[PDB]
Amino acid sequence: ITGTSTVGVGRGVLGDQKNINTTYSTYYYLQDNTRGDGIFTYDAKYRTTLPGSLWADADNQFFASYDAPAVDAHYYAGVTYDYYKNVHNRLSYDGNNAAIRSSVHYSQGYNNAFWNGSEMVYGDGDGQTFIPLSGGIDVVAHELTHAVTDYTAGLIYQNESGAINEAISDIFGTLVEFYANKNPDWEIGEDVYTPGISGDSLRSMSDPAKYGDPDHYSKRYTGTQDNGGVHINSGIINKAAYLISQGGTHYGVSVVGIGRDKLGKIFYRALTQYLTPTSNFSQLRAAAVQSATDLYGSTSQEVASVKQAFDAVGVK
Ligand SMILES: [Ca+2]
Ligand SMILES: [Ca+2]
Ligand SMILES: [Ca+2]
Ligand SMILES: [Ca+2]
Ligand SMILES: [Zn+2]
């Protein structure tokens, strides 16, 4: 929409108040002109027709409970845009400042959030398993990270390359959570998952087996459910990323941690320079070793820790 850039105020899903970039033309629209070619948030109105209507508001105030999921989708898209720009010098998901579009209120009682190849889509959850999915910055950054992958490595969403594609999104969603720095951790979706239970989540990176996911290659899932286990087998790579960052001893193999910033640098470089559509786990290991070598040199602690972490999860 053509009009002027303004600043609105509203409340997110978890009741936190925040400023949002809007655009004024008769109404105030959730259209942020300050980042690339814009961030646009739409109302799907409990239907599944996409994108729906660009979110319009009469007074630039977004405090109705109906407003909350749009507030968070809009604001966290902006945090993720800044993470990639300031940390990786990447401008939007295509690297050319493509518009980031998101729809909330998708369908009824929909317990999921996804990138559909063109935009982000969030369900409201059923109030029991999930509250509105855009309330979790790690969920927002997870799904936007799939857009990043699609424009770079283009890892096919099946078997091993698929589990890599899932792991990358868990890794960068966690790193965005740490970057924004509000109660960060190594679990996925804790903020929006089961309002009745403390400390649970969808998945754990520090301990995948907590929720039934393999933490070692010898335990990979080899059936056909979940596109050959893209959500299950991601646990092996998640645990490797956790060990590279934090360090630890895992099945008797010791790893010196190098911190989150270097983990991000190494995996961002592997993603954008070395992985291809069909990459398997062992090729992920080579790409990450070559990444660490370009960045830190072949004799470095960083390279040594990458090899140790992949050793610990059984990936040679
Ligand atoms: Ca209003
Ligand atoms: Ca958290
Ligand atoms: Ca988290
Ligand atoms: Ca919970
Ligand atoms: Zn995913």
Side-chain angles (χ1 to χ4, degrees):
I1 226 149
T2 306
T4 1
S5 307
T6 53
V7 185
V9 65
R11 220 176 263 130
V13 173
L14 307 180
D16 53 326
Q17 184 177 302
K18 60 246 271 172
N19 291 328
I20 56 264
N21 289 119
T22 59
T23 294
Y24 175 78
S25 177
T26 310
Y27 280 99
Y28 296 86
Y29 289 99
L30 296 186
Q31 171 178 141
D32 172 4
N33 311 123
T34 73
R35 290 174 169 95
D37 290 327
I39 300 178
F40 304 79
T41 307
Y42 295 81
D43 195 352
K45 294 174 179 170
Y46 307 131
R47 312 289 309 201
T48 59
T49 51
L50 295 171
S53 303
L54 185 58
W55 194 286
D57 188 89
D59 65 9
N60 218 19
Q61 284 179 241
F62 301 81
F63 296 113
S65 59
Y66 196 74
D67 298 334
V71 165
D72 280 346
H74 197 68
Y75 182 92
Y76 299 142
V79 176
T80 308
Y81 175 97
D82 294 345
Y83 170 83
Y84 280 102
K85 173 189 181 268
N86 298 328
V87 178
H88 299 304
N89 204 39
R90 185 182 188 87
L91 304 183
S92 196
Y93 54 88
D94 63 347
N96 195 42
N97 269 159
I100 296 162
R101 310 186 188 274
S102 315
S103 310
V104 298
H105 297 307
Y106 179 81
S107 188
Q108 296 178 27
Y110 190 69
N111 290 319
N112 202 24
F114 62 92
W115 172 259
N116 79 346
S118 316
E119 65 162 286
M120 285 297 313
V121 189
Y122 309 85
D124 292 318
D126 55 16
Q128 218 211 343
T129 310
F130 278 92
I131 61 170
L133 278 102
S134 61
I137 186 165
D138 58 4
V139 176
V140 173
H142 174 113
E143 291 297 338
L144 285 168
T145 301
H146 284 305
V148 178
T149 292
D150 289 1
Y151 273 90
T152 62
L155 291 151
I156 289 145
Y157 203 65
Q158 171 96 25
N159 310 331
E160 274 193 19
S161 67
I164 309 173
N165 191 326
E166 283 295 326
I168 292 286
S169 276
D170 286 342
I171 288 163
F172 283 104
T174 295
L175 297 181
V176 171
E177 192 173 295
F178 278 97
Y179 171 82
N181 199 24
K182 298 215 32 25
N183 304 315
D185 51 54
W186 291 93
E187 319 256 307
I188 315 306
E190 66 290 342
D191 284 326
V192 294
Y193 190 68
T194 67
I197 306 148
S198 292
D200 60 343
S201 57
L202 234 21
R203 279 190 296 295
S204 174
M205 294 177 72
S206 53
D207 184 15
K210 203 205 160 166
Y211 307 105
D213 298 323
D215 57 0
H216 196 273
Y217 198 71
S218 66
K219 303 166 196 223
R220 71 208 180 271
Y221 170 71
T222 56
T224 64
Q225 302 167 44
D226 179 39
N227 285 114
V230 308
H231 292 94
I232 291 146
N233 286 335
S234 54
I236 291 145
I237 306 310
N238 285 349
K239 181 78 191 186
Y242 175 80
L243 297 164
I244 290 157
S245 181
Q246 300 306 106
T249 306
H250 178 61
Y251 296 100
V253 177
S254 274
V255 183
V256 195
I258 65 188
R260 284 182 313 267
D261 288 334
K262 297 187 187 163
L263 167 74
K265 283 168 212 267
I266 302 180
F267 272 70
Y268 185 73
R269 183 170 185 97
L271 183 58
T272 63
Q273 314 258 2
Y274 294 108
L275 301 172
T276 71
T278 57
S279 284
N280 63 32
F281 281 9
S282 164
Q283 291 166 331
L284 167 65
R285 175 189 175 124
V289 167
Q290 188 56 235
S291 286
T293 296
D294 305 353
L295 290 141
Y296 303 110
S298 87
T299 59
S300 70
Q301 183 48 264
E302 292 79 10
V303 169
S305 291
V306 177
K307 306 195 183 149
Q308 274 291 277
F310 281 97
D311 286 351
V313 294
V315 166
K316 268 60 158 204

